[PDB]
């Protein structure tokens, strides 16, 4: 509990050194008072979101629409002393954010409660705290109950809190107001009129004489214009407001691509010399929504191409962070977009900072639901008595800002319709009215919707509402854009939701086919942009809509950014967590539409190849390339396969816009796969080349190289870098459809904030070390510490070279000299007798993110360090600076003898792989071409193993492998009938007497006039339950086909549903492809079911009509194949040829101590019975061997590890 610290700065952060608790059993009473001894209580700092830490329950009280994550209730703690430098002057606490029903005590009593919990509040605190210098006990409960939102929201402190420490005489909470009226006029002389509609408080005893001086600062520093008031008479306890008008000469106005801003300080003078001091920044813009010709900035017209989005940060879950916030803003201004939806609640600081540096439109969402709530324990519970209080405090806050253009009261309102609606929404804007009076008032409405192809008839309280407000929005409404134009010309409207599609991220499935909220087995949605929800619509359709029309200001497309929670698609599914809808992944890897927006919006040239290139030989694949280009051609390995182009049309207006003859504004390609590089080549309308991009074929996984969007970061403690592991081919290709599980580690000057991969399907904790890569990427996320230095940061695949890259940490005050910060460290891994590479320039890093490559001077190299297998380091010099560099080299290749096993029984050759795997003794893991030893059938027409030598192609080495007697498989060829056969045997929960279950498979049937056939379940006893039926096999084939025709009688209906599962030989699981059908009572059918290993073969049913009973005509069954087999425990263990001390089960791990240097060990291992061992030779000097065994058929095992030990050197 130490005290804050203070420095004069009018805003202290208060982030540091809290506890946490969250309530797992029932209430923890007492923790509001000084008393509890919350000794045990972790510690942690502020931006934090306490359910984003926890894990997946599928039970958790927030469903799909949630993500999953806990809610409930935690609490916080922190105990502080106020240093005497700030005694005797007013002081304040700031929360920008903590989320539902706080409820904040101090010393013992309530400080105070507010519910709504997007948006920032404050209390006041100087009375409270202790002035004799005892410890303050500061308590907040957060009662995140966890039914209380659509999207997943997070839980507890998850935006910054400070301290405001001021004069007893000081400015207002938001007491300045900086406007400039008629700006649209006054420019024509270059003339930006001012108005500073200042307050200022006096917390004194007594009024006193009050006098103001602000000054406009320049954006470099320098001042513009001053200006000083008259003084006047400030009564206490009461606010008194001045205005004060100036003129700036030659504006610098703020602008989409060129933001610039001016910096206001007001300093409060008393007594003829300062008390207080206020800074806010603004800028001079002006803008119209006109009903005719839409948005225009400036005298600029321009689309509103914009974006919805959730507060959401993704892998930080909710927490606020400066830099995430900035990627985010960063990334979604790189795909052209000029404005940004926000949410359905007000806007992070962070949020608006980055909007007015990066110049982006912002929208402000007020509620998401009025007195009419949503959820059990949503917002609408507390409406109608803080819906006032929080719509003022998010307008007062957002005024000054020059990035917002707007306040939209609401969206999805389900009570919108009643008259009740129309006199709140009345009220709401008038409230919003009252301290604002600048930008309009909008609201997003869904029920106009209807019929999504025809004009819908606008119901009267939607008009009256839509009159109320200044501009009109309209959710997947695009039939009614021009329809209401005509019908009412007042209105100014503008597309608040569009085009809420689906897709994932390197999935590329039903090329062809565009369906309407289909779920699918694999649970993942098509990259094609094929696939959206029922009221949603292409992309391509609402651009279209959108772009045709010059009334309509713009479009926001809905998440630009996934989040999570909200997966519509897969409502209630199981493993699915977070929304499709975004154009960039959660963790933040663009998608390709992406990319087509970027070609629609940007005016930049580009191409983007939409398709990966690992597909199978001889198959046709869809190949889009969304460009802005005039022409394309495809250059596959060497041939063009034919060009295609777009037209200039014009619209009614005559905006220039391109697009094909058929109305696509993507170019098309239908190709037959042939492995290698596919280029692309952007022509102008001349014909020359003005942008290339190539899709290029990739081989096996070789490596887990990282990479890093900032090499330096500040040192303040909170500063990210976004480091990207990818799986990529030994060229370095990435693999399109690599997915291994990746273990980071981190060290130095930072800690790791989170991993991501960007499956919305994966259900693995984001506050971990390792991660599951999805489509051949994932994310890890370092944030630097108080301490400069650097973080270094290392990614290790089992059967991959690892890899390790590092991010420099300088202090705040060196982030804007470019003094040297440090420089990256070369990897190298040669093979044997193989020289080094070492670049003549490397790249040295400056601060300020300022890197570039300079020159470089190697110190002398020795052969010998190559012509044998090991490890070293190499050193070198640079011009420009005093610090040295450093390179890594890696000798590796042939060692020793690897081991390795494969299968095989009676009847059947050994499972010969055409692949060897060159795991050297030292870490090797290449794979090479092996042709396998020829075997006679003596050998495998009887039981027991044998030795088969591998005859590795290009590799001095053979390779050696064991044989197992389990494997059993022949072909896939039709069969018909077996004279003899013991395989056809069934058998159910319950049949009939009188209906032989071993009648299904006779092969007749009654279609046109033949016996009939059937099998009876009706039993006087009900059993609407369920009853399955069952069919052995043991044969070494695939099956074809599967029959589940139905027999239905006055008693017997079809059943509801067939759950079909497989037994491979230990249990039963479900099978693959089930394409369960519908009522099928007049007609034939047909199924294809997968091929899997079915030793027993049953499927589940249930009634189609409860109350009645389960029957059917033919279930025919065909094939199955067998695996595996028995085994014994572990046997042997060795260490060089020699024996092992104190070797048994019950101790974990075994250990040699041999003389420092030695050469490492060979370690063998053998099992009784010839059992499956995980043999590991030893690879390097640092390390231990693990061994696993299989053994029986269960859980039976036991873990063998045997790590070199040595002696000092």
Same mark, same amino acid.
């Given at each position: 509990?130490?005290?804050?610290?203070?420095?004069?700065?009018?805003?202290?952060?208060?982030?540091?050194?809290?506890?946490?608790?969250?309530?797992?059993?029932?209430?923890?009473?007492?923790?509001?008072?000084?008393?509890?001894?919350?000794?045990?209580?972790?510690?942690?700092?502020?931006?934090?979101?306490?359910?984003?830490?926890?894990?997946?329950?599928?039970?958790?009280?927030?469903?799909?629409?949630?993500?999953?994550?806990?809610?409930?209730?935690?609490?916080?703690?922190?105990?502080?002393?106020?240093?005497?430098?700030?005694?005797?002057?007013?002081?304040?606490?700031?929360?920008?954010?903590?989320?539902?029903?706080?409820?904040?005590?101090?010393?013992?009593?309530?400080?105070?409660?507010?519910?709504?919990?997007?948006?920032?509040?404050?209390?006041?605190?100087?009375?409270?705290?202790?002035?004799?210098?005892?410890?303050?006990?500061?308590?907040?409960?957060?009662?995140?109950?966890?039914?209380?939102?659509?999207?997943?929201?997070?839980?507890?402190?998850?935006?910054?809190?400070?301290?405001?420490?001021?004069?007893?005489?000081?400015?207002?909470?938001?007491?300045?107001?900086?406007?400039?009226?008629?700006?649209?006029?006054?420019?024509?002389?270059?003339?930006?009129?001012?108005?500073?509609?200042?307050?200022?408080?006096?917390?004194?005893?007594?009024?006193?004489?009050?006098?103001?001086?602000?000054?406009?600062?320049?954006?470099?520093?320098?001042?513009?214009? !001053?200006?000083?008031?008259?003084?006047?008479?400030?009564?206490?306890?009461?606010?008194?407001?001045?205005?004060?008008?100036?003129?700036?000469?030659?504006?610098?106005?703020?602008?989409?691509?060129?933001?610039?801003?001016?910096?206001?300080?007001?300093?409060?003078?008393?007594?003829?010399?300062?008390?207080?001091?206020?800074?806010?920044?603004?800028?001079?813009?002006?803008?119209?929504?006109?009903?005719?010709?839409?948005?225009?900035?400036?005298?600029?017209?321009?689309?509103?191409?914009?974006?919805?989005?959730?507060?959401?940060?993704?892998?930080?879950?909710?927490?606020?962070?400066?830099?995430?916030?900035?990627?985010?803003?960063?990334?979604?201004?790189?795909?052209?977009?000029?404005?940004?939806?926000?949410?359905?609640?007000?806007?992070?600081?962070?949020?608006?900072?980055?909007?007015?540096?990066?110049?982006?439109?912002?929208?402000?969402?007020?509620?998401?639901?009025?007195?009419?709530?949503?959820?059990?324990?949503?917002?609408?519970?507390?409406?109608?008595?803080?819906?006032?209080?929080?719509?003022?405090?998010?307008?007062?806050?957002?005024?000054?800002?020059?990035?917002?253009?707007?306040?939209?009261?609401?969206?999805?309102?389900?009570? !919108?319709?009643?008259?009740?609606?129309?006199?709140?929404?009345?009220?709401?804007?008038?409230?919003?009215?009252?301290?604002?009076?600048?930008?309009?008032?909008?609201?997003?409405?869904?029920?106009?919707?209807?019929?999504?192809?025809?004009?819908?008839?606008?119901?009267?309280?939607?008009?009256?509402?839509?009159?109320?407000?200044?501009?009109?929005?309209?959710?997947?409404?695009?039939?009614?854009?021009?329809?209401?134009?005509?019908?009412?010309?007042?209105?100014?409207?503008?597309?608040?939701?569009?085009?809420?599609?689906?897709?994932?991220?390197?999935?590329?499935?039903?090329?062809?086919?565009?369906?309407?909220?289909?779920?699918?087995?694999?649970?993942?949605?098509?990259?094609?942009?094929?696939?959206?929800?029922?009221?949603?619509?292409?992309?391509?359709?609402?651009?279209?809509?959108?772009?045709?029309?010059?009334?309509?200001?713009?479009?926001?497309?809905?998440?630009?950014?996934?989040?999570?929670?909200?997966?519509?698609?897969?409502?209630?599914?199981?493993?699915?967590?977070?929304?499709?809808?975004?154009?960039?992944?959660?963790?933040?890897?663009?998608?390709?539409?992406?990319?087509?927006?970027?070609?629609?919006?940007?005016?930049?040239?580009?191409?983007?190849?939409?398709?990966?290139?690992?597909?199978?030989?001889?198959?046709?694949?869809?190949?889009?390339?969304?460009?802005?280009?005039?022409?394309?051609?495809?250059?596959?390995?060497?041939?063009?396969?034919?060009?295609?182009?777009?037209?200039?049309?014009?619209?009614?207006?005559?905006?220039?816009?391109?697009?094909?003859?058929?109305?696509?504004?993507?170019?098309?390609?239908?190709?037959?796969?042939?492995?290698?590089?596919?280029?692309?080549?952007?022509?102008?309308?001349?014909?020359?080349?003005?942008?290339?991009?190539?899709?290029?074929?990739?081989?096996?996984?070789?490596?887990?190289?990282?990479?890093?969007?900032?090499?330096?970061?500040?040192?303040?403690?909170?500063?990210?870098?976004?480091?990207?592991?990818?799986?990529?081919?030994?060229?370095?290709?990435?693999?399109?459809?690599?997915?291994?599980?990746?273990?980071?580690?981190?060290?130095?000057?930072?800690?790791?904030?989170?991993?991501?991969?960007?499956?919305?399907?994966?259900?693995?904790?984001?506050?971990?070390?390792?991660?599951?890569?999805?489509?051949?990427?994932?994310?890890?996320?370092?944030?630097?510490?108080?301490?400069?230095?650097?973080?270094?940061?290392?990614?290790?695949?089992?059967?991959?070279?690892?890899?390790?890259?590092?991010?420099?940490?300088?202090?705040?005050?060196?982030?804007?000299?470019?003094?040297?910060?440090?420089?990256?460290?070369?990897?190298?891994?040669?093979?044997?007798?193989?020289?080094?590479?070492?670049?003549?320039?490397?790249?040295?890093?400056?601060?300020?993110?300022?890197?570039?490559?300079?020159?470089?001077?190697?110190?002398?190299?020795?052969?010998?360090?190559?012509?044998?297998?090991?490890?070293?380091?190499?050193?070198?010099?640079?011009?420009?600076?005093?610090?040295?560099?450093?390179?890594?080299?890696?000798?590796?290749?042939?060692?020793?003898?690897?081991?390795?096993?494969?299968?095989?029984?009676?009847?059947?050759?050994?499972?010969?792989?055409?692949?060897?795997?060159?795991?050297?003794?030292?870490?090797?893991?290449?794979?090479?071409?092996?042709?396998?030893?020829?075997?006679?059938?003596?050998?495998?027409?009887?039981?027991?193993?044998?030795?088969?030598?591998?005859?590795?192609?290009?590799?001095?080495?053979?390779?050696?492998?064991?044989?197992?007697?389990?494997?059993?498989?022949?072909?896939?060829?039709?069969?018909?009938?077996?004279?003899?056969?013991?395989?056809?045997?069934?058998?159910?929960?319950?049949?009939?007497?009188?209906?032989?279950?071993?009648?299904?498979?006779?092969?007749?049937?009654?279609?046109?006039?033949?016996?009939?056939?059937?099998?009876?379940?009706?039993?006087?006893?009900?059993?609407?339950?369920?009853?399955?039926? !069952?069919?052995?096999?043991?044969?070494?084939?695939?099956?074809?086909?599967?029959?589940?025709?139905?027999?239905?009688?006055?008693?017997?209906?079809?059943?509801?549903?067939?759950?079909?599962?497989?037994?491979?030989?230990?249990?039963?699981?479900?099978?693959?492809?089930?394409?369960?059908?519908?009522?099928?009572?007049?007609?034939?059918?047909?199924?294809?079911?997968?091929?899997?290993?079915?030793?027993?073969?049953?499927?589940?049913?249930?009634?189609?009509?409860?109350?009645?009973?389960?029957?059917?005509?033919?279930?025919?069954?065909?094939?199955?194949?067998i695996v595996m087999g028995e085994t014994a425990k572990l046997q042997s263990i060795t260490v060089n040829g020699k024996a092992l001390e104190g070797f048994d089960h019950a101790k974990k791990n075994y250990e040699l101590v041999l003389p420092y240097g030695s050469e490492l060990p060979k370690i063998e291992a053998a099992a009784a019975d010839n059992a499956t061992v995980t043999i590991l030779p030893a690879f390097s000097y640092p390390g231990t061997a693990k061994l696993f065994v299989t053994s029986e058929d269960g859980k039976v095992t036991t873990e063998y590890s045997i790590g070199v030990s040595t002696e000092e050197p």
């Amino acid at each position: 509990g130490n005290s804050v610290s203070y420095d004069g700065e009018r805003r202290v952060n208060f982030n540091e050194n809290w506890r946490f608790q969250r309530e797992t059993n029932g209430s923890i009473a007492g923790a509001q008072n000084p008393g509890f001894d919350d000794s045990s209580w972790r510690k942690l700092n502020l931006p934090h979101d306490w359910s984003i830490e926890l894990d997946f329950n599928k039970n958790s009280l927030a469903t799909h629409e949630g993500g999953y994550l806990d809610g409930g209730i935690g609490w916080y703690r922190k105990t502080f002393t106020i240093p005497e430098s700030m005694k005797g002057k007013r002081i304040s606490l700031d929360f920008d954010g903590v989320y539902m029903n706080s409820t904040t005590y101090l010393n013992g009593e309530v400080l105070g409660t507010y519910p709504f919990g997007y948006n920032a509040f404050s209390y006041d605190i100087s009375d409270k705290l202790y002035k004799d210098g005892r410890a303050n006990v500061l308590v907040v409960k957060v009662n995140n109950t966890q039914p209380s939102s659509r999207w997943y929201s997070g839980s507890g402190i998850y935006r910054n809190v400070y301290l405001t420490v001021t004069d007893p005489i000081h400015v207002a909470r938001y007491g300045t107001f900086v406007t400039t009226p008629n700006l649209e006029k006054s420019i024509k002389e270059d003339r930006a009129d001012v108005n500073i509609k200042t307050k200022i408080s006096n917390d004194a005893a007594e009024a006193k004489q009050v006098k103001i001086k602000s000054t406009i600062y320049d954006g470099a520093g320098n001042t513009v214009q !001053t200006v000083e008031t008259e003084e006047k008479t400030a009564a206490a306890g009461t606010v008194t407001p001045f205005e004060q008008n100036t003129v700036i000469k030659q504006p610098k106005l703020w602008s989409i691509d060129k933001p610039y801003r001016y910096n206001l300080v007001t300093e409060v003078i008393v007594g003829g010399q300062t008390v207080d001091t206020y800074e806010t920044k603004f800028g001079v813009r002006y803008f119209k929504f006109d009903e005719n010709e839409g948005f225009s900035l400036n005298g600029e017209y321009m689309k509103l191409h914009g974006v919805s989005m959730h507060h959401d940060l993704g892998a930080l879950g909710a927490a606020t962070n400066a830099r995430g916030v900035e990627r985010q803003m960063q990334i979604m201004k790189d795909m052209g977009v000029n404005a940004i939806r926000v949410t359905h609640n007000p806007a992070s600081p962070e949020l608006l900072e980055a909007a007015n540096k990066l110049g982006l439109f912002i929208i402000e969402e007020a509620f998401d639901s009025w007195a009419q709530s949503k959820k059990p324990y949503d917002y609408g519970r507390f409406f109608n008595a803080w819906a006032e209080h929080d719509i003022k405090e998010m307008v007062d806050r957002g005024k000054n800002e020059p990035a917002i253009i707007m306040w939209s009261i609401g969206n999805e309102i389900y009570d !919108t319709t009643n008259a009740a609606g129309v006199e709140t929404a009345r009220n709401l804007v008038g409230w919003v009215k009252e301290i604002d009076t600048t930008r309009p008032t909008t609201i997003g409405e869904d029920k106009t919707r209807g019929d999504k192809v025809n004009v819908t008839p606008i119901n009267s309280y939607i008009k009256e509402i839509f009159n109320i407000v200044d501009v009109v929005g309209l959710n997947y409404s695009e039939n009614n854009y021009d329809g209401y134009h005509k019908q009412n010309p007042s209105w100014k409207l503008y597309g608040s939701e569009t085009s809420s599609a689906t897709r994932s991220r390197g999935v590329y499935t039903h090329p062809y086919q565009y369906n309407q909220s289909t779920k699918y087995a694999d649970l993942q949605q098509s990259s094609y942009d094929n696939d959206y929800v029922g009221w949603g619509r292409t992309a391509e359709d609402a651009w279209k809509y959108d772009r045709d029309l010059k009334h309509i200001a713009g479009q926001f497309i809905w998440t630009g950014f996934d989040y999570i929670g909200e997966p519509t698609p897969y409502y209630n599914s199981y493993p699915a967590k977070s929304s499709y809808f975004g154009a960039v992944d959660t963790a933040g890897f663009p998608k390709d539409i992406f990319y087509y927006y970027q070609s629609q919006w940007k005016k930049e040239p580009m191409v983007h190849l939409l398709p990966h290139w690992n597909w199978k030989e001889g198959e046709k694949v869809r190949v889009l390339a969304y460009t802005n280009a005039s022409k394309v051609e495809l250059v596959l390995n060497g041939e063009s396969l034919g060009e295609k182009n777009y037209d200039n049309k014009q619209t009614s207006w005559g905006a220039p816009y391109k697009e094909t003859k058929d109305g696509k504004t993507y170019l098309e390609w239908a190709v037959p796969f042939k492995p290698g590089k596919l280029e692309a080549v952007a022509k102008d309308e001349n014909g020359k080349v003005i942008a290339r991009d190539q899709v290029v074929t990739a081989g096996e996984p070789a490596s887990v190289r990282l990479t890093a969007d900032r090499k330096v970061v500040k040192a303040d403690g909170t500063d990210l870098s976004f480091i990207t592991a990818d799986i990529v081919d030994s060229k370095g290709i990435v693999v399109p459809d690599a997915d291994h599980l990746i273990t980071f580690n981190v060290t130095g000057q930072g800690e790791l904030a989170g991993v991501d991969n960007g499956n919305a399907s994966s259900v693995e904790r984001y506050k971990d070390n390792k991660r599951k890569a999805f489509s051949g990427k994932a994310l890890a996320i370092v944030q630097s510490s108080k301490l400069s230095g650097k973080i270094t940061v290392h990614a290790s695949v089992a059967g991959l070279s690892s890899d390790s890259t590092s991010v420099f940490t300088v202090t705040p005050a060196d982030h804007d000299k470019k003094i040297v910060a440090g420089i990256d460290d070369v990897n190298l891994t040669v093979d044997v007798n193989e020289a080094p590479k070492l670049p003549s320039e490397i790249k040295v890093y400056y601060s300020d993110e300022s890197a570039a490559a300079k020159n470089v001077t190697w110190d002398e190299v020795d052969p010998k360090q190559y012509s044998t297998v090991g490890e070293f380091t190499v050193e070198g010099s640079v011009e420009g600076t005093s610090l040295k560099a450093k390179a890594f080299v890696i000798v590796k290749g042939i060692v020793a003898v690897k081991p390795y096993s494969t299968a095989t029984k009676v009847g059947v050759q050994p499972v010969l792989p055409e692949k060897a795997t060159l795991l050297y003794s030292d870490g090797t893991t290449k794979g090479a071409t092996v042709t396998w030893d020829e075997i006679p059938e003596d050998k495998l027409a009887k039981e027991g193993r044998f030795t088969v030598e591998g005859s590795v192609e290009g590799t001095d080495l053979k390779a050696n492998v064991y044989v197992r007697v389990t494997n059993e498989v022949k072909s896939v060829n039709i069969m018909l009938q077996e004279q003899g056969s013991a395989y056809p045997k069934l058998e159910a929960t319950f049949t009939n007497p009188a209906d032989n279950l071993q009648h299904l498979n006779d092969g007749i049937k009654s279609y046109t006039n033949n016996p009939v056939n059937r099998w009876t379940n009706w039993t006087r006893t009900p059993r609407d339950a369920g009853d399955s039926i !069952t069919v052995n096999f043991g044969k070494k084939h695939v099956i074809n086909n599967l029959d589940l025709f139905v027999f239905t009688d006055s008693g017997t209906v079809v059943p509801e549903k067939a759950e079909v599962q497989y037994w491979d030989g230990t249990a039963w699981k479900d099978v693959e492809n089930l394409t369960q059908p519908s009522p099928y009572v007049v007609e034939k059918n047909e199924l294809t079911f997968d091929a899997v290993a079915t030793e027993k073969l049953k499927f589940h049913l249930t009634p189609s009509v409860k109350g009645k009973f389960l029957a059917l005509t033919e279930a025919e069954v065909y094939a199955d194949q067998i695996v595996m087999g028995e085994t014994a425990k572990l046997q042997s263990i060795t260490v060089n040829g020699k024996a092992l001390e104190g070797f048994d089960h019950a101790k974990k791990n075994y250990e040699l101590v041999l003389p420092y240097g030695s050469e490492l060990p060979k370690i063998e291992a053998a099992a009784a019975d010839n059992a499956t061992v995980t043999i590991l030779p030893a690879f390097s000097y640092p390390g231990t061997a693990k061994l696993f065994v299989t053994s029986e058929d269960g859980k039976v095992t036991t873990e063998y590890s045997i790590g070199v030990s040595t002696e000092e050197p």
